Design an enzyme around this catalytic site. Structure first.
Site, PDB file in Angstrom:
ATOM      1  N   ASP B  38       0.860  -1.182   0.000  1.00 34.35           N
ATOM      2  CA  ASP B  38       0.000   0.000   0.000  1.00 34.35           C
ATOM      3  C   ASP B  38       0.891   1.225   0.000  1.00 34.35           C
ATOM      4  O   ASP B  38       1.140   1.844   1.050  1.00 34.35           O
ATOM      5  CB  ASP B  38      -0.972  -0.035   1.188  1.00 34.35           C
ATOM      6  CG  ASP B  38      -1.993  -1.180   1.073  1.00 34.35           C
ATOM      7  OD1 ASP B  38      -2.425  -1.492  -0.053  1.00 34.35           O
ATOM      8  OD2 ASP B  38      -2.321  -1.814   2.103  1.00 34.35           O
ATOM      9  N   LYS B  60      -0.016  -7.957  -3.302  1.00 31.90           N
ATOM     10  CA  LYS B  60      -1.318  -7.336  -3.452  1.00 31.90           C
ATOM     11  C   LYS B  60      -1.198  -5.821  -3.692  1.00 31.90           C
ATOM     12  O   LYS B  60      -0.594  -5.088  -2.890  1.00 31.90           O
ATOM     13  CB  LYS B  60      -2.245  -7.663  -2.272  1.00 31.90           C
ATOM     14  CG  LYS B  60      -3.645  -7.121  -2.477  1.00 31.90           C
ATOM     15  CD  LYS B  60      -4.562  -7.388  -1.299  1.00 31.90           C
ATOM     16  CE  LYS B  60      -4.242  -6.481  -0.102  1.00 31.90           C
ATOM     17  NZ  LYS B  60      -4.623  -5.056  -0.303  1.00 31.90           N
ATOM     18  N   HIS B  62      -2.879  -1.898  -5.117  1.00 33.24           N
ATOM     19  CA  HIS B  62      -3.949  -0.991  -5.504  1.00 33.24           C
ATOM     20  C   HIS B  62      -3.372  -0.066  -6.548  1.00 33.24           C
ATOM     21  O   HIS B  62      -2.789   0.951  -6.217  1.00 33.24           O
ATOM     22  CB  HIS B  62      -4.462  -0.151  -4.326  1.00 33.24           C
ATOM     23  CG  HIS B  62      -5.172  -0.940  -3.266  1.00 33.24           C
ATOM     24  ND1 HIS B  62      -6.422  -1.507  -3.454  1.00 33.24           N
ATOM     25  CD2 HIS B  62      -4.807  -1.242  -2.000  1.00 33.24           C
ATOM     26  CE1 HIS B  62      -6.789  -2.123  -2.344  1.00 33.24           C
ATOM     27  NE2 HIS B  62      -5.829  -1.979  -1.443  1.00 33.24           N
ATOM     28  N   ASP B  91      -6.241  -5.740  -5.866  1.00 32.85           N
ATOM     29  CA  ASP B  91      -7.347  -5.687  -4.895  1.00 32.85           C
ATOM     30  C   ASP B  91      -8.269  -4.554  -5.337  1.00 32.85           C
ATOM     31  O   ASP B  91      -8.367  -3.501  -4.700  1.00 32.85           O
ATOM     32  CB  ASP B  91      -6.763  -5.392  -3.505  1.00 32.85           C
ATOM     33  CG  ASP B  91      -7.772  -5.513  -2.343  1.00 32.85           C
ATOM     34  OD1 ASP B  91      -8.951  -5.853  -2.535  1.00 32.85           O
ATOM     35  OD2 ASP B  91      -7.365  -5.218  -1.181  1.00 32.85           O
ATOM     36  N   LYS B  93     -11.606  -4.946  -5.861  1.00 36.63           N
ATOM     37  CA  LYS B  93     -12.951  -5.146  -5.314  1.00 36.63           C
ATOM     38  C   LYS B  93     -13.998  -4.720  -6.348  1.00 36.63           C
ATOM     39  O   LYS B  93     -14.833  -3.849  -6.106  1.00 36.63           O
ATOM     40  CB  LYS B  93     -13.134  -4.358  -4.011  1.00 36.63           C
ATOM     41  CG  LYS B  93     -12.176  -4.822  -2.893  1.00 36.63           C
ATOM     42  CD  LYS B  93     -12.393  -4.034  -1.600  1.00 36.63           C
ATOM     43  CE  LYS B  93     -11.609  -4.680  -0.415  1.00 36.63           C
ATOM     44  NZ  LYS B  93     -10.097  -4.492  -0.560  1.00 36.63           N
ATOM     45  N   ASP B  96     -19.208  -3.772 -10.346  1.00 32.56           N
ATOM     46  CA  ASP B  96     -20.185  -3.459 -11.375  1.00 32.56           C
ATOM     47  C   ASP B  96     -20.397  -4.749 -12.184  1.00 32.56           C
ATOM     48  O   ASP B  96     -19.780  -5.791 -11.905  1.00 32.56           O
ATOM     49  CB  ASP B  96     -19.708  -2.273 -12.225  1.00 32.56           C
ATOM     50  CG  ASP B  96     -20.762  -1.220 -12.371  1.00 32.56           C
ATOM     51  OD1 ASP B  96     -21.834  -1.582 -12.879  1.00 32.56           O
ATOM     52  OD2 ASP B  96     -20.542  -0.053 -11.988  1.00 32.56           O
ATOM     53  N   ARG B 221       0.694  -2.942   6.781  1.00 33.66           N
ATOM     54  CA  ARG B 221       1.476  -2.047   7.654  1.00 33.66           C
ATOM     55  C   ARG B 221       2.408  -2.766   8.632  1.00 33.66           C
ATOM     56  O   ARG B 221       3.495  -2.264   8.941  1.00 33.66           O
ATOM     57  CB  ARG B 221       0.554  -1.080   8.394  1.00 33.66           C
ATOM     58  CG  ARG B 221       0.334   0.235   7.655  1.00 33.66           C
ATOM     59  CD  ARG B 221      -0.787   1.046   8.283  1.00 33.66           C
ATOM     60  NE  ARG B 221      -2.092   0.470   7.967  1.00 33.66           N
ATOM     61  CZ  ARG B 221      -3.244   0.832   8.526  1.00 33.66           C
ATOM     62  NH1 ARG B 221      -3.289   1.795   9.449  1.00 33.66           N
ATOM     63  NH2 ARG B 221      -4.361   0.219   8.149  1.00 33.66           N
TER      64      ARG B 221
END
Lengths: 247, 249
Positions: B38, B60, B62, B91, B93, B96, B221
Site C-alpha cells: 500500500d 497485493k 492498488h 485488490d 474489489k 459493477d 502495515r
C-alpha cells in the site's frame, strides 16, 4: 410531497444536493445520463450536446482509454456552462487510507472533479468515513447503493435499512441513494434509479409509482442514432412523472 | 476430510491453473504470506517487490493509488514476479456488472487483466460481477477471489451473504479460485482462502492460519511501516508457514 425547488431550500439540505435540486427545477430535468464511452472525444461531445437536457452526467473514468486530467477540466467547463453535476460511478467499497487515496489520489484524482461519487455499504460505515475525510473538506457528496435489481442481488431488507441509517448518520457527506424506489422518507435525500428504459422499468414507474427523483439512463440514449432526441424523450417522460406526483 | 499439503492440493483434479501455480510456489518457497503493497509511488512498489519477493507467494496491489502509474511500471513488476515467483493480485474489489465491469478489468488506463494474475470482487450485486469479469478473465487465463466475509465494523456479510458467495464460487469454478475471508468458508480443497487483518501483536497468523484454517495471510502495515521490512516479512512468513505445518497432521 415537496418540489425539487422547495427541497433545495430545506434547512438540513446538503449544499451539493441543493445545487442539484435548483438546477433540476430551472431546467426541468431529472435525467442523469450514463456516459458509458471509452474515448474522451465521445464523452465531451455527449456532455456538450446533451448538457442542456440533463441534471447530471454519470462517468466511469476508469474505462476511458485516453483519460487525462485535462479531459476532466474540459468536462467541468461543460458542467458549468450547461449546469449539470458530474457523478463518478466508482462504487467505492474499501476503507481506511486505501479508500481515501482511491478518491483523492492516484492518476484519476476523482475528488478534484467529481461533484458526486457512490459507495457500497456492505463493508460497514468505514467506506463513507474514509471518503468523508477527503470529501467533506472538498465540499463533495456521496450516494449510498441501498438497493439493486440485478439477478442474485443480496441487498436484503436489513441491508437496505442499514444503508439508510448509514446515510442519516453521515448527512454532512451523504446526499442520497442509488435505489429502485424511495428508501427514505426524509426529503433532504435524493433517490437515483438505474435500469430505466422507455420500452428495466419505465420513467413513469420509477418516478411516478416508486417515488424516485432521478432516472439514470445509458443505452436507451447512447445507442440511439439521435441522442438529443432520445435524451429529450427521457427528460420529458421523467419530468412529467415528477410533476404528476406533486399535487 | 484429510488436510492436504499445498503441493498436493496443486495436483487436485479440479484445481484451477492459477491456483495450482500459486500452491506450487507456496510449497517450493515455504511462504503463504501475501504482502499488501500500500504505497503511492512506483519506485517504492518495485523496491519492496524485489526485496521481499523471495519471502512472499503474492503481492497485493492498488494500482489506482499509484501517483505515477504507467503500464511500464507493471511490466517491471511482472519481471520481479517471474524472477522471485509470486503472483500479482490487484485488490480492485470489482462490483459493477456487464460491459462496465469488463472494460474496468480489460481496459481504461490500467488494463488490469494484462498484468494481474488475480483480482477480487464483491458478490452483493449477484453473479453478474463474476460473469462480466470472466468474459475477460477466462480467455486471459486469470483467476478471481470473492469477498465472502468481512471483519470491518458494521460489515453486512451475514451467514446467508457468505453462503451465497461460496455458491457463486462453485458455480463459476473455471474462473473463481477462492475467497477473501476471516476463516474457512468452503470445505473444497481446490479453493484458496486469504485473510487480511493480520498482525503479530486483527488476529495473529497462528489464529488465522492455524485455528481458523485460512491458507494465506495478507499483511500490510505490519511489514510496510517497520524499519526492517525484510525482517518483518520473514517474521510473518515463518509465523504463517509454521501455523500451516502445524495443522497438516
Amino acid at each position: 410531497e415537496l418540489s425539487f425547488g422547495a427541497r433545495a431550500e430545506l434547512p438540513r439540505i446538503h449544499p451539493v444536493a441543493s445545487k442539484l435540486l435548483r438546477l433540476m427545477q430551472k431546467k426541468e430535468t431529472n435525467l442523469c445520463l450514463s456516459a458509458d464511452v471509452s474515448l474522451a472525444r465521445e464523452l465531451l461531445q455527449l456532455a456538450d450536446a446533451l448538457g442542456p437536457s440533463i441534471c447530471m452526467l454519470k462517468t466511469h473514468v476508469d474505462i476511458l482509454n485516453d483519460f487525462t486530467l485535462d479531459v476532466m477540466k474540459e468536462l467541468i467547463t461543460l458542467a458549468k456552462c450547461h449546469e449539470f453535476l458530474i457523478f463518478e460511478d466508482r462504487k467505492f467499497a474499501d476503507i481506511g487510507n486505501t479508500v481515501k487515496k482511491q478518491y483523492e489520489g492516484g492518476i484519476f484524482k476523482i475528488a478534484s472533479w467529481a461533484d458526486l461519487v457512490n459507495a457500497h455499504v456492505v463493508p460497514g460505515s468505514g467506506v463513507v468515513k474514509g471518503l468523508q475525510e477527503v470529501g467533506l473538506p472538498l465540499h463533495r457528496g456521496c450516494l449510498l447503493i441501498a438497493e439493486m435489481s440485478s439477478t442474485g442481488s443480496l441487498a436484503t431488507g436489513d441491508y437496505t435499512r442499514a444503508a439508510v441509517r448509514m446515510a442519516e448518520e453521515h448527512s454532512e457527506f451523504v446526499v442520497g441513494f442509488i435505489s429502485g424506489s424511495r428508501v427514505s422518507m426524509k426529503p433532504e435525500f435524493l433517490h437515483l434509479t438505474p435500469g430505466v428504459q422507455l420500452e428495466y422499468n419505465s420513467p413513469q414507474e420509477v418516478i411516478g409509482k416508486r417515488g424516485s427523483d432521478i432516472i439514470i439512463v445509458g443505452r436507451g440514449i447512447i445507442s440511439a442514432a439521435d441522442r438529443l432526441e432520445a435524451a429529450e424523450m427521457y427528460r420529458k417522460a421523467a419530468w412529467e412523472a415528477y410533476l404528476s406526483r406533486l399535487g
